[PDB]
Design a protein around this ligand. Structure first.
Ligand SMILES: *[C@@H]1O[C@H](CO)[C@@H](O[C@@H]2O[C@H](CO)[C@@H](O[C@@H]3O[C@H](CO)[C@@H](O[C@@H]4O[C@H](CO)[C@@H](O)[C@H](O)[C@@H]4O)[C@H](O)[C@@H]3O)[C@H](O)[C@H]2NC(C)=O)[C@H](O)[C@H]1NC(C)=O
Ligand SMILES: *[C@@H]1O[C@H](CO)[C@@H](O[C@@H]2O[C@H](CO)[C@@H](O)[C@H](O)[C@H]2NC(C)=O)[C@H](O)[C@H]1NC(C)=O
Ligand SMILES: *[C@@H]1O[C@H](CO)[C@@H](O[C@@H]2O[C@H](CO)[C@@H](O)[C@H](O)[C@H]2NC(C)=O)[C@H](O)[C@H]1NC(C)=O
Ligand SMILES: *[C@@H]1O[C@H](CO)[C@@H](O)[C@H](O)[C@H]1NC(C)=O
Ligand SMILES: *[C@@H]1O[C@H](CO)[C@@H](O)[C@H](O)[C@H]1NC(C)=O
Ligand SMILES: *[C@@H]1O[C@H](CO)[C@@H](O)[C@H](O)[C@H]1NC(C)=O
Ligand SMILES: *[C@@H]1O[C@H](CO)[C@@H](O)[C@H](O)[C@H]1NC(C)=O
Ligand SMILES: *[C@@H]1O[C@H](CO)[C@@H](O)[C@H](O)[C@H]1NC(C)=O
Ligand SMILES: *[C@@H]1O[C@H](CO)[C@@H](O)[C@H](O)[C@H]1NC(C)=O
Lengths: 49, 49, 259
């Protein structure tokens, strides 16, 4: 669940998704277009009342 | 056919397609029709009744 | 007619590291345990050398036990070492595999081969003449051909869960008698679902001549090493590539660097 945006990363030849040190997925090869995307938490930051 | 006598146990995803006499006492044997020789394969019996 | 092999041993330096998993990483140090070639261990060398006095040919090709993996290096010219034979008894009682790569193309076969005494390919550096590897093959299960036509060539052979793993690397060197020194990483190329019991392997050689019906000798060498259960540490760069590794059972600095 999250917002999808254009990406500028590089993928090592054949590769389907990329993760980070916390194993948080943040990239997909989105088949039928082959244009790498970026994933982001729906809401992240901080809201105070 | 299914194998009935073998010295050791097989490993995962490994097959054996051998047919050699199995000596009960020891390692090798090259003569059947004896009092201690045993063919290593036995045949199922799928009859009507 | 052959001469008793010289089972001389050199030092393995820091070679024999390969890729142990298919995950993707970036700037990560991962500690693993597995079956690897220990650093600075005796590597047994076999040689092919020109005859000088008479029938003094050093045509080395014994049966080397597989155990728990194998590391195989070759320093040669004009492609004298070409193929490998894996099996258990290497007879027509048990299924065996041949993984020839040179010649016309890469031929990978699993059959009930009845091999000869000297698995020697009677060809030259180009436009080959004959093929002497087989005598009979009754029951063939796998036949594959892959389209493809002093140095250092490196291979690693493993057998896990009925899959034969082959890893390969190449480098260009210049040396005369000793063994080189340096760091190499082996990339995964071949993974075959054969599912057979491999306990012995043998090499295939070629005899270069001079437009004659008689064949004799070449200059080359191949090195053999056995794998052992160890623990190691690896390092990854931005774009996945192994830059260095350490052996956590060699010297106190190694266990310090591994803890
Ligand atoms: C891969 O293939 C090789 C054969 O090419 C297998 O190697 C065989 O391994 C067995 C041991 O498991 C070895 O010994 C045989 O079994 C007994 C000793 O362990 C001996 O026979 C027995 O003697 C007992 C005592 O008298 C008796 O109670 C029992 O009933 C039986 O008679 C004898 O020594 C046998 O030879 C074989 O020699 C060995 N064959 C070889 C080396 O050619 C290997 O196990 C296979 N690996 C896998 C994973 O399947
Ligand atoms: C999967 O199919 C889609 C069409 O359903 C392909 O997208 C078209 O690709 C062609 C070029 O090959 C373009 O000219 C079209 O404009 C594309 N149309 C759409 C709907 O995207 C897509 O290329 C195919 N994927 C693969 C890997 O062939
Ligand atoms: C990862 O790959 C990039 C791209 O190949 C490497 O950066 C290149 O480095 C070479 C010199 O070695 C330059 O000529 C290129 O212009 C560089 N390209 C880019 C996109 O930076 C980078 O060095 C590699 N790094 C790793 C971790 O291997
Ligand atoms: C190699 O073998 C020689 C002779 O047995 C031995 O002295 C030497 O220590 C060995 N090398 C290794 C691996 O330590
Ligand atoms: C030894 O002599 C035999 C004779 O048949 C020959 O086939 C074999 O190739 C010779 N040895 C080598 C390794 O060339
Ligand atoms: C099997 O191989 C042995 C040894 O080479 C040979 O004596 C025998 O004739 C061969 N039999 C078959 C099945 O071809
Ligand atoms: C090959 O398999 C057939 C059964 O399909 C069998 O009759 C034949 O004897 C086998 N031959 C060998 C030597 O593997
Ligand atoms: C090392 O380089 C020299 C010069 O190119 C060459 O003659 C020699 O054959 C090379 N090494 C060996 C012994 O193959
Ligand atoms: C040519 O053949 C002869 C043997 O007849 C051999 O001694 C010589 O080294 C060969 N030279 C070449 C050009 O290969």
């Amino acid at each position: 669940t999250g917002v999808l945006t254009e990406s500028t990363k590089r993928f090592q030849s054949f590769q389907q998704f990329g993760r980070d040190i916390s194993d948080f997925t943040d990239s997909v090869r989105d088949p039928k277009t082959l244009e790498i995307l970026d994933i982001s938490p729906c809401s992240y930051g901080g809201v105070s009342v | 056919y299914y194998r009935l006598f073998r010295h050791g146990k097989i490993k995962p995803y490994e097959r054996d397609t051998s047919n050699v006499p199995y000596n009960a006492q020891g390692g090798t044997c090259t003569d059947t029709s004896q009092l201690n020789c045993y063919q290593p394969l036995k045949s199922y019996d799928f009859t009507d009744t | 007619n052959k001469s008793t092999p010289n089972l001389d041993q050199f030092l393995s330096s820091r070679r024999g590291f390969y890729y142990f998993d298919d995950t993707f990483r970036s700037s990560v140090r991962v500690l693993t345990s597995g079956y690897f070639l220990p650093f600075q261990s005796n590597l047994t060398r076999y040689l092919t050398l020109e005859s000088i006095t008479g029938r003094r040919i050093y045509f080395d090709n014994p049966n080397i036990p597989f155990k728990d993996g194998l590391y195989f290096a070759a320093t040669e010219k004009s492609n004298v070492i070409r193929g490998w034979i894996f099996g258990s008894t290497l007879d027509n009682t048990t299924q065996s595999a041949v993984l020839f790569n040179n010649g016309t193309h890469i031929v990978v076969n699993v059959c009930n081969f009845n091999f000869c005494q000297d698995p020697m390919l009677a060809i030259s550096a180009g436009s080959p003449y004959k093929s002497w590897v087989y005598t009979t093959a009754t029951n063939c299960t796998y036949n594959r051909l892959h389209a493809f036509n002093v140095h250092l060539r490196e291979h690693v052979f493993r057998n896990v869960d009925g899959f034969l793993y082959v890893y390969h690397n190449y480098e260009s060197i210049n040396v005369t008698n000793t063994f080189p020194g340096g760091f190499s990483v082996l990339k995964p190329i071949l993974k075959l679902p054969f599912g057979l019991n491999i306990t012995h392997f043998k090499v295939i050689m070629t005899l270069f001549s001079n437009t004659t019906q008689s064949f004799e000798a070449d200059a080359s060498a191949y090195f053999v090493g056995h794998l052992k259960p160890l623990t190691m540490l690896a390092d990854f760069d931005e774009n996945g590539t192994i830059v260095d590794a350490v052996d956590c059972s060699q010297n106190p600095l190694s266990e310090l660097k591994c803890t």
